[PDB]
Structures are given as structure tokens and as C-alpha cells.
Symmetry: D2
Subunit: 331 residues, 4 copies
């Protein structure tokens, strides 16, 4: 008789798979911010971490494990071998190079496409029925790449896209109006990057159109220069990188927001990277952000946002830029 069997009588001898497992690939600052945010939101019964830097991977895993008393995720594992990711409902990809001070996310394409050619087939091997949530940059291009490599249906390949750009826009609109961002509504669509599109025509508080109240909203003639709010959204990651070297907390919270809608099947609307072929006359297989209904099958529906002619032209410009990159990739 050991202490454990003196103390505990066992009824059930058998291993069951987890019901709500999430994997995070990449344990850099973005991956770990996604991991802690998901842990504190009680979204998973198992969290797996994967990376190729084996000591940092084990250290991050242990540091999370040591906080288990304070969490409700009873199993946290890690390994360089993708077998640790088996049976995941949601696999969040954050691995890859990140942009340095002043560098475009679009400058990361060659490196991160090559990294994805290794990661995605291994994720798909061990969790053939997962949803993929791509966070690595440039996220629109890499969501297309993950879709092409995985062979998944496009509903199950979701880019974090402009969920964060829209959150930043709502934060800045809240600061100008003195209203919590939850009650400030406004969308930034298109590329998660320099060509994103602020949809002035949809901005509102309590269903009151700000453009109807202020017809010059967003234009160069605007005495209040609201276009500067979108400029600040575009420049946000650059400013934060210049100041602290990288960004992590806001994208971790944005990714956890997306994970909550997926894992809890909420059917909330988020601007995420998806194929927009068939909207706005676009015929190319281009991925960028539009508002999507998110739940347990990933993206089940696209919202058809009415755009002004100027907003639509900007969105088509974003799509042209991204498709010019995406069309040249070779698999």
C-alpha cells in the first residue's frame, strides 16, 4: 500500500481526451500573452504550448503550471513534438519573425511563409478537426497561407485580423467622447496594417450615426480631424514597438476575445481575416478582415457591410495590395 492508494480508492482507470483543448504555437511575448489571457478566461481544460526553443518552452510551461492553484485549467503541457497538440479544438499560431522598429509587417512574408510550411502540416496531422486561429504577421497573408497548406475548409481558418485595430479605434473614440469603448461602435476593416479602412459611415454611439451628425467626419476638411484617430490606429504597433520593443498585451486580449466566441459558440461578430471573394465585386481569393459571425465551426457567415464609394475604394485598394502579395506565393 502506497500513500496514494491508502488515501484514494480509484473507480476509473481510463484516460479520456480533453473536451476543450487549446494549443498555442509560439511562446514569444505574443504567444504567452495569448496563453495567460486564455487561462484567465477559463476557456480550456487543457493548454498545450509548442515551439522549437526547447528550454524557453519548458520554462514558460512550468511558470504557468506553478500558477495552477489560481486557474481552472487542470492540464498544461508543452513540447517541440507536435504530438503534445493532439485533439485540440483550437490551435492559435503566433510563431514567426516579428517586425522591428519601423518595419512593415509585409516585410515578414518570406520568413514567415517558410515557417508556416513547417508548422501547419504538423498541426493538421495531430488535430485534423481543429479551428486554426492565425496571429503571426502579416496575418491576412498568413491566413491565406494556412488555408492553402492545411486543406481545411475556409470556415476553420481564421486570422486575428482587425479585431485589435477595431479595439484600438473604439478605445480612441472612447477617449474623444468620454464613453467606454464598449459603447463606442466603429469598424476598421481590410489589412491588419497600413492599408486598413476606417468605416466612418458605421460609427455610432447608441445607434446615433456620427457621420450624420458630423458630415465631414473622417475627411480632410474635418475641423476635428477624426482621420487622425485612424492614423493613430495604423501607427499604434509602431509606437508601442518603438517604446517597449514589441507589442503583446492588447493582441493577447484580442486573441482571447476571438477564442471566447469560438470556444463558447457565441456567434458574435468580429472583424477577422477571411476570404472576401464575392463581396464588393472582388473575384480574387484574397484574405483580409470583414465582420464575421464566429462560433464553434469558426466563421459561419460574413456580414455584408454597406460601404460608401470612398470606403469601398479604400477596401479594394487594401485587397489589391494584399492579393498582389498572396498571388505570388508558391506552395
Amino acid at each position: 500500500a502506497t500513500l496514494k492508494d491508502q488515501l484514494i480508492y480509484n473507480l476509473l482507470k481510463e484516460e479520456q481526451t480533453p473536451q476543450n483543448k487549446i494549443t498555442v504555437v509560439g511562446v514569444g511575448a505574443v504567444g504567452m500573452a495569448c496563453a495567460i489571457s486564455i487561462l484567465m478566461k477559463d476557456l480550456a481544460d487543457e493548454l498545450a504550448l509548442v515551439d522549437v526553443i526547447e528550454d524557453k518552452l519548458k520554462g514558460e510551461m512550468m511558470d504557468l503550471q506553478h500558477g495552477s492553484l489560481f486557474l481552472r485549467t487542470p492540464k498544461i503541457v508543452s513540447g517541440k513534438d507536435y504530438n503534445v497538440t493532439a485533439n485540440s479544438k483550437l490551435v492559435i499560431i503566433t510563431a514567426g519573425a516579428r517586425q522591428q522598429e519601423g518595419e512593415s509587417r509585409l516585410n515578414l512574408v518570406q520568413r514567415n511563409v517558410n515557417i508556416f510550411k513547417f508548422i501547419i502540416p504538423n498541426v493538421v496531422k495531430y488535430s485534423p478537426n481543429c479551428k486554426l486561429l492565425i496571429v503571426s504577421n502579416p496575418v491576412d497573408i498568413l491566413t491565406y497561407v494556412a488555408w492553402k497548406i492545411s486543406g481545411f475548409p475556409k470556415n476553420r481558418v481564421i486570422g486575428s485580423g482587425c479585431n485589435l485595430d477595431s479595439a484600438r479605434f473604439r478605445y480612441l473614440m472612447g477617449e474623444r467622447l468620454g464613453v467606454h469603448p464598449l459603447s463606442c461602435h466603429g469598424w476598421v476593416l481590410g489589412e491588419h496594417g497600413d492599408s486598413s479602412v476606417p468605416v466612418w459611415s458605421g460609427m455610432n454611439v447608441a445607434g446615433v450615426s456620427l457621420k450624420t451628425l458630423h458630415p465631414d467626419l473622417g475627411t480632410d476638411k474635418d475641423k476635428e480631424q477624426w482621420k487622425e484617430v485612424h492614423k493613430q490606429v495604423v501607427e499604434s504597433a509602431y509606437e508601442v514597438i518603438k517604446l517597449k520593443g514589441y507589442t503583446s498585451w492588447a493582441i493577447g486580449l484580442s486573441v482571447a476575445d476571438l477564442a471566447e466566441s469560438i470556444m463558447k459558440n457565441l456567434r458574435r461578430v468580429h472583424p477577422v481575416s477571411t476570404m472576401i471573394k464575392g463581396l464588393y465585386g472582388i473575384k480574387d481569393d484574397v484574405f483580409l478582415s470583414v465582420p464575421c459571425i464566429l462560433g464553434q465551426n469558426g466563421i459561419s457567415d460574413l456580414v455584408k457591410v454597406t460601404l460608401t464609394s470612398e470606403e469601398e475604394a479604400r477596401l479594394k485598394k487594401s485587397a489589391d495590395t494584399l492579393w498582389g502579395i498572396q498571388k505570388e506565393l508558391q506552395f
Copy 2:
């Protein structure tokens, strides 16, 4: 008429009500910050450090996640006026021991840092609770207590709250039980010299020491003493592997902040002025189980200790005082 004034009619033009300050925006301070934010413990969070670009960037990165949070004001600055009217001020700033440096010299460097920080915290929040997280935490909790002039109930060290959480994690892994249902206390000094109180280790009120009398001894064939060895060594291991520890101490500290801010009167093993107990006759802070709430430490539990356990706490007190009596304030 601005857009704002067309949209919004103003009824009227306050002091922070449930504010927390984190001093130091290294990995520990920011893990404390994110854990406090995702537990909705504060209506205002202030960050302070002296590295101004890093500080502003950390503040901005948190602010950009505001849509996903329920803490409507996040502020920062090198000037301590940003900390005014904090209920709880969490100190994580400090130097790390460098190659070759004596323990006394590292502590003295952190005394010198605290001589800048603590008076400024006290100026702007004279009625706060101070929660010291910086290492070596038991000595730096004494340092903060001396400099602040606060009563001992309002100066708390994070102490062995995390050591105990690690113990309960490791015990749960051995037994196949969640750590919430695995009870055991690690007391005394944080880190190397901590004391596992084997008599208190239990599941469902069943004493493991009574079931297994070799528990905690070297002759134990099951080597349960290895659980405490790993409480000590797993910290070193994380530091070797990833460079530092952050997430578990953030969650531990948010645990403590919850009991204080919500006045819960939960018991935690935190570092408190222990002069009077266990034959200890010096001004030293060690971890014992403390009742935590809105006035800080209001009460503590008098754990019955074996002869050997008591002697370990007294030896620790002697060691800490040996360093403290040499410090230059």
C-alpha cells in the same frame, strides 16, 4: 458645437475609489498588472517606473486592450502623483544580484532604490496597503516597513504565497487531485530556507502525516520530501530555462490583491512582522498564515510547529537580522 457636444449632454463635471498601483514594469510588475486587470480588482490601475519609454509603451499596450477589460482608467508616469489615492501599492522594482555580488551588497542596492520609491508612495497614498514583491522579499518588506513608517498591518510581503501554491501544484500532480483540494503550507523565508509544515498536509481533512508517518523525512521510501525540494528547485529551474519567473508570481500577487481589495479575510502565507512568535525577538518578517482584508493583515494563525520547525524559523530570523542590522538607511 463639437461632435461630442452635439451627441452628448453633460449633467456634471472624482477621487479614485478602488485604485491599485504597480511600481516597476519589468516582467513581474506587468504579470501582476495583467492578472489584476483580468480579475477586475481595480477601477483605476497606475504604473510607475523610471524607464520612461518602456513605461509609456506598457501603459499604451494595456490601454489598447481596454475594450476587453473592465478597468476604465489605466495611467502611468515617472511622477508619483499618478499613484495618488491608491488602496494597494504593489512594489516589484529592484535590482537583481549580479555576478560575484554579496547578499548584503545586493540588499543595500535595493535599500537605496526603496529610499526613492517608498517615501513617494507614502506621500501620495498615505493610507494604502504596501505589498512588497521585490526580492529578497522578507528583508525588503522590513526595509519598506522602516522607510514608510506604516503600522505592520499595512506592510505585507508576498512571502511564501507562491511557494505554497507550488507545493499544492506538486502535491496535486502526485495525487491526481486539483491543487484547490490539496492543502499544505510552506512558511518562513521565501525560497531556499522555506519550511514545509508536514503536519498540515491533507486532502479532505485527512492528515497525510498521520497516514504516512515517514512523510517529510529522509527515510521515506516514497520521498515526499522531494515535493518541498522541488518547491525550492523548480524556481531555479524556471530561471535557468526562460531567464526569469513571472506568470506564477503575477497570479499569486493577484490572489493577495483580491483578498485585500474585496475584504475577504482569506488566509494566506505572506510575510509579516513576526517578533514575538517562536522565540523570535528581532524585527524580521517571515511568512505565517495571515488573515488578509481591507486593513491588510488583521490577524494571523498560530500554527503549532515541531521543535525542528520552530528552530528553522528562529535560524532564519537570526540570518535575516544578521543582514538587516548592517543596512544603511
Copy 3:
């Protein structure tokens, strides 16, 4: 040498005042649904319950106390004496009269005046600086009654108003569209219940106005009968009363959401009943729902919603009717 003193060393005895205390007046089904919802949202460090039926009051308190292990509100108190309510940040009133067969609305409101002439001065005595949240019906008139008796400034007297009517609207819109109500936006304003006003222009998903897409929205010429959504907002409450005898759960959750914005100083926008003289075309001291910014000082600001001629006229007709009753009340 008591067990307690053997076990516990006391460091100090200092008189504690709660920092985040809430009182609920009335422990009928509505009051208790508000209480359980506030407890399970961790909004208060002390909950006080008050009512005039002493046995029921004590029983409810005891039943909640027995669940303390599962909560993070360490003190729950109750009594018929208002001294238990001292130093509340927020006092929620759910008590008041039941209308009798044959009794005029004026006479019913006068009985509530007489009941509130007891309740409200006792609340004010013990928590002079609280916000008052009136949930008792008829809520818009009773919010006026509480404001008059309390002598509080407008910002600190709030009626729950159309907060639940709007939540019902968003639920019903989400059911039609297959979208979570969080992502379905729409506002019901004016009087709570029968005479409320659905603001069709503000009904939207992702900033897309349903009225713009579908100009017959809200009219009798609408083949999809979207007007029926607001008919159901009005009628679904009668239906719940017919089926189970009363409503409780949804108003409890509604009220807890208002309490969250107030207690956490969020400055979220809610349609609650506020003193609307000088705004929205009205000239009398009446309370109606409009979107209000809620936080630690109660209503600090409100949103000026652009209304159609018909909507404006309905709010004005409501104001005339409320003032017609209020001017005959005896305080």
C-alpha cells in the same frame, strides 16, 4: 484560552466601513433576483437586504449566507431597520404597491408616494451619498417620486427604465438574425412597458442600419413584419406573467448590469430613466429612458438621439401623461 484565541492572534481591532456596499429594498422575486445576480458578479463587499416582512427577510438572508463559500461577498445582512443599510454606494428599490381592481393609476401612484415617504428618507439618513436605482413599477413615475422625496441631484436618481426592454429587443433581433444579442444593436426608449418607443434608425449589426437596407422596417408595409419584434418586447412580459406568474430573472440580470457600470465606474451607455426636462422637447419634470452614461456618480451624461417626428411625438405624449399624474400627487 478560547479556541479562537488559541488559534488566531489579533493584530488590531479597527472599525471597518464597507467600501462597495449595495442595498436591495424588497425581497420579493425581483429583489432576490437582483441580489443573486449582484452576488454572482462580485460587485459588492457587503449586501444588505431590507423589507417589512421579517420572517421572509431573515429566511432569504440566511439562504444566501449559506452559499457564502461559493461567493466573494463576505458580509450579507438584513433587517426591517434601515440601519443595516448604512454607507451603501448603491441602493436598489424594488418595493412598492400592487394595483387593486378598480383603483385608479393616480391612486396607486399615491400609495407608492406614501410608501416611499418612509423608505426614501430612511435610505438617505443612512447613505446620504448613495446612488438610488428604482426598479419598482411604474418605474418612470416612481423614479420621479424618489427624486422628489430624496432631494438628490438628478445624476444620482436612476430608474431601471427601458434597460430590460432594450435587452429583450436585442434578444429577439438576435433570434431572427442568428447573431448573439451582444452583436445586435437597437434601442427602446421612453416609457418602460406598453408605451415604449423602438428607435428603428439605430437598429444595426456591425454598423449596418437595418432600416437603410430595408426601408419598410418598422412599418405596416413590411412583409417581414419587423414591427412584431417591438410588439413582442411589450407582449413577452405579459406572456411571462401569464405563464409563470411574474417576471424576475431577466430584470435581475438587467439590474446587475446597471450596477456593474455604476460600481465599476465604467461609463457604459444604458437606456435608463432620467429627468428629461429641457431635453428631447419636454418641458415638465418627468423621467423617461434615453441612453445615459453610467458610472460612479450615477448618470453623468446622456446621449441626444435623433428621433423621427413620430418618435418625438410619442415621447412628448408620454411626458404629458406622466406629468398629468405627477401634478396631482400629494407629497
Copy 4:
């Protein structure tokens, strides 16, 4: 060309089973307290309610649905037909008759057998892999009844047992000591109600045995009368029933805590009713509360608490009494 189709482009027809579904059977006060507590803890992605009182059932469902905006459980359904319960992970049974004037315990139990013969086969048909959590009283005997009728293995038939008795004990110990109940530890085992057994040896704060500190603990000689804490557990419930008519909130919260451990696979330890044959000299098919490890598959393990001879004899006497009733039941 419907408004929904103008607004929303559908990608995905298919609809999956809910993945984290809970059913509550019985929509009396206990069942609805369980329902609201499970909803406010975000434990389920679908909640089903079943009862045979069809109007009350529909009313309760609608009242919860109207609070959807404030919840993260996107589907709430109800019906008399058990097809609404399909694919539940957890089925909570609160239905049953109360003991009437002049009624023997045997005949009350038999009336509840007759009720469970309708319920349990229908629950099993539609969720053959669920855990059954029996809350109906007398709970230890009705857990046996559910087990016999369902044919389920003992790990998937759980009685709420002494979980709330123990929570009450910890509340009362916290009141005496001035410590939150979370930091007061102590176990009430055996039969729920009058015959339950306070295990004095395990009562502790911070691992400090109160029995070792205060050897008279739990004896008649105790000057502090700690025995009366257990008497109060046995009677505070009768007291709540006397004062408000029934108990509900504390049950609802304690059942939601059980459900959290099961749905999140936490492997926390709870004192619940489980098949105890083979322990403490018991040789009959009887259910009593012992500390059990709860998770995805129900009860996976039991803690073998060390009992005094007196304590063990009390459990054996309970077992003899329960079997004396059970052996006379007609299935």
C-alpha cells in the same frame, strides 16, 4: 432577398451538437436556482429545462432567454418532450414529491420512484453518456433509485449529498472564527440531513487541527459547544424553510460548484452521494456522502477518510436504515 440575406452571407449550412450542454429537470425553486447559478458561471453552451407543468416551464425558459444579452450561454431551450435534452453532458434532477402529512418515508420514496420511472429512462434515451446529478430529496436513496433505473455505472450517478451540509458547516465555522469560509475546512459526511456525521478530526484552519488544539471538540463536555455547529447545520435548513417556505439559493450555488468540477474536469474533491458498498463494513447497495474526486467522467475516485469507531458505526447504521427502505421499493 430577405433582410437577413441582404445583411448576412452564409458560408456554412451545417449545425453541430452543442458540446457543453446541461439539462435541469424540474423548474421549481431548486431547479431554477441551479439554472441561474449555472448560467452566471458560464458552464454550458446550451441549457435545457424539462418539466411537466407546461406553462410554468415555458415562462421560466422565456424569462431566462430575456436575459441572454447578459449571459454567455447562447441557447436556452425547454419542453415536456425529452428530445430537448439530447446530448447533455450533465443532467441535474430536482423533480420529485415532498413528504406529506401522515406519509411514511418508504411511501414517499416509492412515490418518487414512480416519478423517476418516467424521467430517468427518457433522460438516458437522449443522453446515454451523461452524468446524472440527483438533487431531489431524500437524496441518498433517490441517488440509488436513479442508479437502479438508469443502469448507469456508479461513476455517472452522483447525489448532491452533503455538499451543501459541508458548505453550511464551513460558513458557520467562519462566523465563529472571523475567517472566510474558503479558509475554514471541515467535512460533513454520511446521510444528508439529521443523521450526517461531522468529522471533527479534519476541522482545521491553515492545516492546524482544531481537535488537537481543543481536544474537547465535538464532545458534550466542550465548554464552547462546538457540537452545536453541526446541530445548526442539521437545523438552519429547517429554519430557512420555516421562515421563507423552502430553501433554494444555497442549493443552487452548491450544485453549480459540482457542475463546474464536472464540466471543467477539475478533479476537485466534494462530499457527494456515491455507492459506498465495500467501505466501512457496508455490504448493501447504498449511497452515502464521502469526499469524491469529480471530473469529466463523474466520480473517478473516493477519498478514504480515517474515521473513529463511533463515526464508522454511524455510517454503518445509516447504511442499514437506507437498505431497509430500499429493499421494500417496487421498481
